[PDB]
Amino acid sequence: AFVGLSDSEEKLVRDAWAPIHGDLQGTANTVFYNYLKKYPSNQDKFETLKGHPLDEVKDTANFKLIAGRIFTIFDNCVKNVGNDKGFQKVIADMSGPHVARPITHGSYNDLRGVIYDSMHLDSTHGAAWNKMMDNFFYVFYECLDGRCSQFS
Ligand code: HEM
Numbered sequence: 365a366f367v368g369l370s371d372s373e374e375k376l377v378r379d380a381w382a383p384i385h386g387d388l389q390g391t392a393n394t395v396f397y398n399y400l401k402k403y404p405s406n407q408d409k410f411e412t413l414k415g416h417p418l419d420e421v422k423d424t425a426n427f428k429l430i431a432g433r434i435f436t437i438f439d440n441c442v443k444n445v446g447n448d449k450g451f452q453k454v455i456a457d458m459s460g461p462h463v464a465r466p467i468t469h470g471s472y473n474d475l476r477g478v479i480y481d482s483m484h485l486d487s488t489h490g491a492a493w494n495k496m497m498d499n500f501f502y503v504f505y506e507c508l509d510g511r512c513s514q515f516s
Pocket residue numbers: 406409410411412430433434435437438458461462465467471472475
């Protein structure tokens with residue numbers, strides 16, 4: 365279920381994300397690369413990237429756009445960490461294009477893990493981050509399951 369964050373936890377999430385927020389595209393590029401390198405089955409899910417060596421696509425506009433769009437959503441989630449309806453709407457809107465896609469929960473969770481690992485958070489900040497991410501996935505998976513209207 366969705367579990368709201370405290371004022372102090374919101375601050376922790378904002379602070380945790382600050383290094384990434386100040387280098388959003390650069391972080392996106394690195395994290396998305398590491399994701400596709402560690403879990404190569406996922407590259408084929410992206411039609412613009414399918415059929416090319418990862419090292420060949422990593423420097424392309426197609427690749428950087430995809431990475432940027434993932435991180436822009438997370439950036440907007442962080443922006444809305446204190447507004448549950450707003451946070452839910454960000455996810456609801458991005459969920460639509462994923463509904464019909466053959467992407468496992470494993471793949472989504474693998475991406476979450478790459479992001480977590482890159483952030484090297486202490487346990488206080490990590491706890492708050494995981495509260496937000498648990499909310500993210502609750503909303504996302506509800507929407508993938510056709511129960512997105514509950515957040516409207
Ligand atoms: C959970 C974090 C994720 C976020 C925030 C996110 C966000 C987005 C955004 C903003 C778009 C652009 C909308 C569009 O033009 O379709 C998109 C498209 C897409 N995403 Fe995701 N995504 C996530 C996870 C994933 C994962 C893990 C995969 C595959 C392993 C994936 C596969 C795709 C595909 C296939 C498209 C549309 C086709 C294209 O890439 O051009 N998404 N996503």
